[PDB]
């Protein structure tokens, strides 16, 4: 469109958009694709990837992305066309920064957004129908924050303290097993008692296996008697060829232009396929999932592999926003965690969201992070990574930057490194574990109590250096 | 369009498609695109193939079909676009066969449509505007058959009995040979007596050669004096690039976006290439061809190589029925033979209709059939596998299967293979032949004349 | 090796050899590699084939030769070295001929030998040990008569009159159809009725099937009983992946350098193999088939697919030669018909040698000799070109055009294409069919016994011109 | 060479080798390749990795092998030309396995073989000059133990009981901890206190860094007045760019035919080279490393990375013996463990050898294992396939199945499965241990000294079922 001249935090900078209106901390830039001029030379650029799990760091714009392998599981790590290219687009947010501390930021406030990052420039592209932008020069925080402060938000209170089945039991859980354990648990000062992925039959077909046989309903009885609330997953539009839904209704499977299911990438060691967000009948069928999760007694909710609604990237985040716009109608005043979800298009409607890829009991695993070159992979710094670049989330969602640990036993982690991720929690205020207390020392069952007891203070003294307490952390060494 | 469910011949059928309403037979759907799901785990697909020389078959939809080669001579094989696609595609009709033996059929009802054929769906995608589609679960034979009613028709009584010259004298007739072969063959009990390919000068070129001296006139009289009728045969569309008509009017040429002659195929040794059927000063030149043989006296017409009128494919099923609707009008009443002609996009018009590759003196070129992978080339094999998937269309048209060969001079086949397409010229009741009574034995003669009476 | 001038052919010649001598017709070189450069400019050169169904012909050494197809076939056209080739390269002989009509021959006197045909030189090289070549200068016909009276000879009398099962039933035989046929072609003045491939078990099963529930040596008594020499078709040394003897006796397969078998053609829809030539084993069991045979009541023997034995090429000739001579005593004085074979590295061993591919009942496949390259699959064009070309071995052995067809039923060949045929057969002298008198119009039995009974003489006018009794029989538009 | 035939394990067996004659348990083969041609279909081949860390199982010969990933780990892994090759090869011995719980053995006897394997053969190859075969054909267990018993032997009593510094600190190490561990450890009924990889400044720069401020002889002084031995680890013939021996002597460097320095794999983040085996100078240094380790009161080497002196491969194995020969000279009655070291090749010199990948705290990285293909990664599974697959070398070597966990603590591997590898020190009886014992809880400190203490009588009752005191183990799942 038409080219525009600005003085945006005492800098002269030159854009093309079709239309331009002050904003609170920037302007507001209209147009299908705006294209941004820095006034300096970029030192690097913010590549913001799609969902919880995908890469958000800064990058060098001068140097080429590396392929993501295996391309089996492209499609649950990032939007597949960020991954495929070969410059640096970022999803829906990207910003360029000065030698001096300071960002200009490119921001869509619409839905299904890129913004490509080169040295000279930043440039936004809408995959539909144009929409609005953010644009804003100045600190680095403060135009992210501004940014945040013109996107939905649903802060309700604070983030509750969970014990969740997962980094512990994964899936080998069972309804004798957990019994046992929420006994062990109901004595420490938790909120929510969640379990994890383990519990169903098949992917859509969400119903008890034969591991918990006196049902779901009877496990969250057994949780309230204990002043807890009960919490149960869901992946809701996710399926494996092997499930009896994909079978019994093949029309309810996400399909190509030539009628071929969508990959949804590879886990449980079988190909991943979705639910089609877009058919009204799957809508209603993964809403009264959620009244039937409320019927049992259930009022935390993880609703997982949530980019499978979105699929293929912001093409589907038209789709994407309206599906979980009724589910959110369905759980009422229920807790959503937003997990494997597209990080942005979620903002309003979840609860808490991801902002990471899976924390591990271990730090890095090489060969997935650096041969393979995949850093939506689980551990502890690739969990950490994307966090730190998304905790200006914090006042539009709950921001849960993952489990944290306490057990030596059955983890790699080293103290030092269990506390960096602990840290974030009581920054996000999300505090949960999966840590079994019998997997527990006396010394580590005391410091578990402490931390969901007490609340501490923290001040966030830059980028990647906060106070909490009194204890200084740095993470700069990490990335 | 919008999800529907269906109770389609007592199994529960989902569908996708803009609309609904109730046929004989099963369903009528509309939409550009409409998406079938088998309620069962499909056993196979019917493959329907574009042309009279096509493939139609049922096929595994699991193994990916093989390349045909040479690459030269796909555009006379088929939809040029199945033979490209990785995919098992047919034209205007796919079923989907689940393991009780029982078909489930999406078929076109308007031109220019395919259909994907895997085992967990039936896709029809029409190449241009939308279109109206028959769905339908049931016995194999009767879910095809109930298709045949709703398309179109032309059924001229009792189909002709003709002697045709190409199955013996290929392109090396004349007139002093045929008009030995006429005297003869008129002791038997045949209604047309059809010239084929050798009379003209070129492709585009449609008058006598030195052949035939005294012209194709003079021997339509001949052929009418001994009480039959005279059969000519054209390639109305075709043409080569040493056609005089190539170089005196490029303009009727058929060229892509970029200007060069769209290919179609390869033969008589030489590339070949198509008339613009879209072109409507070409349609009128095609339209005084069948003009000018019912001048010189032919009221029995082949028309070979009608697949150039209808390049590229599906996209082109608009300007191929038009352009034969015109034929089909300058005609009149005369017989129209259509040959290498989309099957399903000239119903209505032709009263004769080829639908298998050529039959031969021999059983099957394994050396086209397999090695180069092409189940379009000659073959009584070949002939009679097409044929046998086509014969639903018994209602709309005339299904000719090719010629009968009584002969075993100057022929390969075994006297059993012969019996096969013999007893599938009584059955579509197209009876003809290509042997010189001269080459028969006092046997064969009487074969010859014993399969002529109707009965 | 040493550079050399001569005068020949009054041209003179330069060569390059490691020793010259005189001869009869030309000189003799020694050495393992000898290269000649004719004093004109090569308008033709010879190209001659391996084996029998091999191409020999002139060929334009400047365009380039076409890839035979498909890839699986090759070992049973050629040579395979001559065809993965991009040069013009012939199996022992070869010749480049000048504008004047005459032609510059080299052709080796030993076994294992290649010769390279450029416009600018002939080059011949030996595989294995170093041998002795014939180097002429001349008229076209004298220099290859005077290359055949320096190689072996085998002349057994007059060239027998065969009844061939093949070109009529092909694989469609069996003892009692043959037996009936037996009995009308006693008839003609037939001297052999030999039973072709079909009356086997398998590759490596030479014993009667369920087709010939009497034994092999019944009808061999049946067909003396007539008055005929009984006759048997045999591929001795070629196998297949599901025989019973390439499981049984897996050290019997021919095996490359690493231990996998080779590759020896594609017939009958499967993968063919061979036998090792060059185990005692092997060859013994092969001269037991002779032996099995001749104690049948069979004395004319068809020996087929005598390639595999020398596979993979020139280098395999000197395992041929010394099993074939095994076989060779074996049969004592019974007639061998070798078929498939090494054509120069059979003289002396075979009695009768085909020299062309199969007749056929028909003219050419186009699909095979054109879109596939193929000159070595049945058909009369392609069994003409090669035999005309291989006639100069007429002092050396029986000479076998294929059968003469005079039937019209059950086949395509026109009247004047046949008698291009029989011609050829009248000139060598080898006078077979396969047409069962069953198939044959009284005129046609008529022709057949005058083919038979009569001594047609024969005279040679030029390379393809020739009058057969006193009509003149012209080849040239073939070429 | 000679085509024979032979009566082994009442089956009829063909081969062609240049020499034959009688032996224990089987024949001796000769030549410098031998093929065996097995009587029946094999239903597997025995796949032969070069050394310590390779793959060691049975695998189906007629599916492709995959390549290992990156390139840049392949010396590392194997023999470089067992992974670049397309079929199964494998190293010194190789077998194919009948449908009848028996095996068909072809073993080399001296140094630089291959083995190929097929279904249909076993094709035996020098690299080198020719050499001696063991052939055989009878129970899985009892041919390779008759092989075992043709080979070179050094058991030299029982195998010591050791507390490696690896599997814990990993290089983490220093000499105010490792004094701090020694104490703790002392308590404990080892016999070995081997501080491994940590010690040294760089690769080939053998002295202490500035974490041993003391010196080596100094800890070897230590640990002696507790009643233990001093171990110490090397990788002689180990060197990277950075090291000050390969900028001080780069004509120690083993190179190619281009002078370019041979690659030796990537490990500790940079490219890994080798010192020259050939190198006479050399050899007479890494023996100066056996006698200053020996003078610093070590009586316990492990030697580590032997690859290297053997690089490329086979063809390497002659100068690798030489060399090996050397070292072991210099240790005098010292104990030497081999580790990374071709198997076969060091039988005789070594007193213990490793047989398998390192284990690890985990039971399998999925990705270096699955993705990249790469069976040589650490890991409890890698470990113990391999290790099964070379227990028959008992008799020849002391086996070390690597280092035995009894922590839960820094540890990902649950009680059954660490209880697997526990069973094969037992079998084996080289019982070793990383765990630090303040790691360890109570229960486990018992556990590890009972482990110490006791000597558990262990019984195989198949090729992957062991009865270890009363309990049944069972490893067949695991492959």
Not at 61 to 90: C, Y
Not at 100 to 121: F, I, P
Not at 159 to 184: A, H, K, N, Q
Not at 216 to 230: C, N, T, Y
Request: net charge negative; proline share 8%; charged share 25%.
């Amino acid at each position: 469109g038409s080219h525009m001249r600005l003085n945006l935090g005492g800098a002269e900078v030159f854009l093309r958009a079709e239309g331009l209106e002050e904003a609170p901390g920037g302007v507001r830039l209209w147009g299908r694709e705006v294209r941004v001029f820095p006034p300096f030379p970029a030192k690097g650029f913010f590549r913001h990837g799609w969902q919880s799990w995908s890469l958000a760091a800064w990058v060098d714009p001068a140097q080429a992305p590396t392929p993501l392998l295996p391309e089996a599981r492209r499609p649950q790590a990032d939007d597949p066309f960020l991954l495929e290219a070969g410059a640096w687009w970022g999803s829906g947010v990207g910003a360029l920064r000065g030698p001096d501390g300071r960002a200009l930021l490119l921001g869509a406030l619409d839905l299904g957004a890129r913004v490509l990052g080169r040295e000279d420039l930043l440039l936004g592209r809408y995959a539909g129908k144009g929409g609005a932008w953010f644009l804003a020069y100045g600190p680095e925080e403060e135009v992210f924050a501004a940014y945040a402060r013109l996107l939905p938000r649903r802060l309700s209170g604070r983030p509750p303290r969970v014990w969740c089945s997962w980094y512990s039991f994964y899936t080998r859980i069972g309804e004798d097993l957990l019994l046992r354990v929420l006994d062990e648990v109901a004595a420490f000062s938790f909120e929510v008692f969640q379990i994890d992925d383990g519990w169903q039959r098949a992917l859509g077909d969400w119903e008890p296996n034969d591991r918990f046989p006196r049902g779901m309903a009877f496990l969250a009885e057994r949780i309230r008697e204990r002043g807890l609330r009960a919490g149960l997953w869901f992946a809701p539009f996710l399926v494996t060829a092997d499930s009896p839904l994909f079978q019994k209704r093949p029309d309810w499977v996400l399909r190509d232009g030539e009628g071929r299911p969508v990959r949804a990438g590879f886990n449980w060691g079988r190909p991943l396929y979705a639910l089609d967000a877009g058919n009204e009948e799957v809508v209603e069928w993964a809403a009264d999932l959620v009244r039937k999760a409320l019927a049992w007694g259930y009022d935390y909710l993880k609703l997982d592999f949530l980019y499978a609604a979105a699929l293929p990237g912001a093409e589907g985040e038209a789709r994407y926003r309206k599906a979980m716009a009724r589910l959110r109608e369905a759980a009422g005043e229920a807790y959503l965690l937003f997990c494997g979800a597209p990080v942005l298009a979620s903002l309003g409607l979840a609860d808490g969201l991801r902002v990471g890829p899976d924390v591990a009991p271990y730090w890095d695993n090489e060969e997935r992070s650096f041969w393979l070159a995949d850093p939506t992979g689980p551990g502890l710094r690739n969990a950490l990574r994307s966090t730190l670049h998304r905790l200006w989330l914090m006042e539009n969602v709950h921001v849960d930057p993952d489990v944290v640990y306490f057990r030596t036993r059955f983890n790699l982690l080293s103290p030092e490194e269990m506390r960096l991720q602990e840290a974030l929690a009581h920054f996000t205020g999300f505090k949960a574990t999966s840590d079994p207390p019998s997997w527990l020392l006396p010394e580590e069952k005391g410091r578990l109590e402490a931390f969901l007891a007490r609340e501490v203070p923290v001040r966030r003294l830059g980028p990647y250096r906060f106070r909490v307490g009194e204890e200084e952390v740095d993470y700069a060494p990490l990335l």
